[PDB]
């Protein structure tokens, strides 16, 4: 992995991002969920790099990246991604993928950096903003995580993140996810929670998209259910919708081979 100071149009103008960059060819940048880190996408990075260039950053405030206290808007996160691609000399088009919060970042990127997208991969996410109660709950999470750390978040989220089959067959995957949460920087988690609260409604962005889009969801996703994701996909032109069996909210970790395959086969067409 690498750690580089990049120039970003978001405050504070410069930020240090940690990231993986593996393979050659078409660039595919994959964005993790909340409150996880780049290792969420490790199986896909390690497998897809035989055919594509896979770039996987820790977002601001997560993993090994710089923590910028206050609010980390989805726009700011997207600006950082643009600045990373600029740093790397990927100044043309990329495929951008994101899971959950990372999908919110992808929407912010598509808003602002349309002409940099060859394609979008939207996993286990939604285009609607937070409801008023959801916003308030973000503020409560932010306030508490700054003081107590993310243990309470792991306790609340783990049962909602993965399906029953994962708990049974892959307890090691559960534990990897738990350690990602437990290790997340408290002020980075707070800043992202506040950023999620403030994110705009992307509903009307979707019909205006101009690149092919893959929409992927776990069969048993409790957080962004498949029914709602299918409806979201029907608003996106040039979309493909895939349900990953025997996965909850984290298909890349729960069913890594099936996710890698779905992405690989879709990328081949974007690419050809
Ligand atoms: Cl957003
Ligand atoms: Cl909501």
């Amino acid at each position: 992995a690498q750690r580089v100071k990049i120039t970003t149009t978001a405050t504070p103008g410069e930020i240090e991002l940690a990231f993986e960059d593996t393979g050659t060819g078409l660039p595919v940048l994959l964005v993790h969920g909340f409150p996880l880190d780049r290792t969420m996408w490790k199986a896909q990075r390690e497998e897809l790099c035989d055919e594509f260039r896979v770039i996987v950053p820790d977002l601001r405030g997560f993993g090994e990246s710089q923590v910028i206290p206050g609010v980390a808007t989805m726009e700011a996160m997207a600006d950082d991604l643009a600045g990373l691609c600029n740093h790397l000399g990927l100044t043309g088009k990329i495929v951008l993928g994101g899971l959950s919060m990372g999908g919110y970042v992808a929407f912010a990127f598509a808003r602002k950096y349309r002409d940099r997208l060859a394609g979008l991969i939207l996993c286990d996410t939604r285009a609607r903003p937070d409801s008023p109660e959801a916003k308030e709950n973000r503020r409560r999470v932010a306030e508490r995580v700054r003081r107590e750390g993310p243990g309470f978040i792991a306790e609340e989220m783990i049962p909602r993140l993965c399906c029953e089959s994962t708990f049974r067959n892959h307890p090691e995957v559960i534990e990897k996810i738990r350690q990602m949460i437990l290790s997340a920087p408290p002020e980075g988690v707070a800043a992202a929670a506040l950023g999620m609260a403030e994110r705009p409604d992307s509903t009307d962005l979707l019909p205006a998209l101009s690149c092919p889009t893959l929409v992927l969801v776990g069969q048993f996703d409790a957080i962004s259910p498949p029914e709602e994701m299918e409806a979201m996909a029907r608003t996106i032109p040039q979309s493909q919708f895939v349900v990953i069996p025997d996965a909850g909210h984290l298909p890349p970790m729960e069913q890594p081979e099936r996710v890698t395959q779905a992405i690989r086969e879709w990328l081949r067409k974007v690419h050809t």
Side-chain angles (χ1 to χ4, degrees), residues 79 98 140 213:
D79 292 329
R140 299 289 77 75
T213 300

Side-chain angles (χ1 to χ4, degrees), residues 126 128-135 138 199:
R126 66 204 288 272
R128 266 205 27 88
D130 280 352
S131 71
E133 188 170 358
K135 293 182 181 175
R138 309 299 189 182
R199 79 186 183 281

Side-chain angles (χ1 to χ4, degrees), residues 74 103-105 107-108 111 199-200 202:
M74 306 298 93
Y104 309 157
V105 175
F107 294 134
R111 277 186 193 276
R199 79 186 183 281
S202 296

Side-chain angles (χ1 to χ4, degrees), residues 5-6 34 50 57 68 73 83 94 111 119 127 141 146 155 160 162 175 201 204 213 216 240-241 246 267:
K5 186 173 69 202
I6 60 145
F34 173 91
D50 68 353
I68 310 298
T73 63
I94 66 163
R111 277 186 193 276
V141 167
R146 282 208 202 88
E155 288 290 307
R160 309 190 296 112
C162 300
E175 180 63 17
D201 186 354
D204 296 344
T213 300
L216 178 151
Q240 185 185 151
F241 177 66
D246 300 336
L267 289 170

